[PDB]
Design a protein around this ligand. Structure first.
Ligand code: HEM
Length: 94
């Protein structure tokens, strides 16, 4: 309802295909479907992971303050509170 868009891991994991490039960057779900080409860094790097923990890759690069605010402009919602209370630890990677 209501609030933000609390999406579950599995749901977000569907959103990586053809044309719904979601990513989760620090507990927050961003649709970047219309940002792919705009991204001063490119579509592919975005589309590589998609529907999942692009936090790792995002923070590897670190990203500027600008990008952080610009994330908010693309914010659709958050990780479902269920998993949020228990971010039992990702199997990892890359
Ligand atoms: C909320 C989503 C994101 C936003 C709003 C965003 C925004 C930006 C912005 C503004 C820059 C410019 C950096 C600069 O001026 O130095 C940038 C660069 C870049 N981003 Fe992102 N980004 C996002 C997610 C990602 C993710 C998840 C990846 C990796 C999978 C990625 C990889 C890169 C890379 C590699 C560059 C720089 C490439 C180069 O060296 O020229 N970004 N991003």
């Amino acid at each position: 309802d209501k609030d933000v868009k609390y999406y579950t891991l599995e749901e977000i994991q569907k959103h990586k295909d053809s044309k719904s490039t979601w990513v989760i960057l620090h507990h927050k779900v961003y649709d970047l479907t219309k940002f792919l080409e705009e991204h001063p860094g490119g579509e592919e790097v975005l589309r590589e992971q998609a529907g999942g923990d692009a936090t790792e890759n995002f923070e590897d690069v670190g990203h500027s303050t600008d990008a952080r605010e610009l994330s908010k402009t693309y914010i659709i919602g958050e990780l479902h509170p269920d998993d949020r209370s228990k971010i039992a630890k990702p199997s990892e990677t890359l």
